[PDB]
């Protein structure tokens, strides 16, 4: 079986965590344009049949709560799970509105041995967040399975690097992910879609800023696959 089964009543749930406003005592600026991002992703996945819930401005403990209950829900009638994470970040780390938390402790909530009703099913994480402070200057031209299996971590940027956002059109990565899902979501395989996202981000965006050292920078997303099958969204 080369393809994840879609023979289920529901393609599944799509949980969006959308953090715009941060605790003043953390010194992190607002993430203006993230409502465009979340609205964009919401429509894209809703039209593919996902049941979309958006949670805005969640703390770490609130995030843990939401995902723990999602992980404990019964997903027998679901083909997959999609999780979109929009916030500040640093290397290996994701920010609630209050402080940081390791990304591993969010995603490992859905490990095979911790989430039995998602075993064998694609768990698709899309992560818009900084991963460090480096800037890319660009260059001119019955069967046991691993508990880590069937995850996809589609990061907006390379480990160590900043991730770029526009206040009007949203984050470069989510903008491009939504364009490519719309245009190809009903014909191509997900890894093939994400390669096009990589190309669009890599080619179509370049930074403009007044802050010294931040001008004329580039970005390439980082697609991490533990998927054991091809993922299509329509049968």
């Amino acid at each position: 079986a080369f393809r994840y089964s879609l023979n289920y009543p529901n393609i599944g749930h799509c949980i969006i965590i959308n953090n715009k406003n941060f605790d003043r005592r953390t010194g992190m600026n607002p993430r203006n344009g993230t409502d465009v991002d979340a609205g964009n992703v919401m429509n894209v996945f809703r039209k593919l049949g996902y049941i979309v819930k958006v949670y805005n401005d969640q703390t770490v403990a609130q995030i843990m709560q939401v995902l723990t209950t999602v992980a404990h829900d019964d997903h027998s009638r679901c083909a997959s799970l999609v999780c979109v994470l929009l916030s500040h970040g640093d290397e290996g780390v994701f920010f609630g509105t209050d402080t940081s938390v390791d990304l591993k402790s969010l995603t490992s909530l859905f490990r095979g041995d911790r989430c039995p009703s998602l075993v064998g099913k694609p768990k698709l994480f899309f992560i818009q967040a900084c991963r460090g402070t480096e800037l890319d200057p660009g260059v001119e031209t019955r069967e046991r399975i691993p508990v880590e299996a069937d995850f996809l971590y589609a990061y907006s940027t390379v480990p160590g690097y900043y991730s770029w956002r526009n206040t009007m059109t949203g984050s470069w990565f989510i903008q491009s992910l939504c364009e490519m899902m719309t245009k190809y979501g009903s014909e191509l395989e997900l890894l093939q879609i994400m390669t096009r996202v990589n190309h669009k981000v890599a080619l179509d965006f370049e930074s403009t800023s007044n802050m010294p050292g931040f001008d004329a920078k580039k970005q390439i997303p980082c697609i991490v696959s533990m998927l054991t099958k091809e993922m299509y969204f329509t049968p």
Partner: peptide, 4 residues
């Protein structure tokens, strides 16, 4: 453009 801003960093996130």
């Amino acid at each position: 453009d801003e960093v996130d």
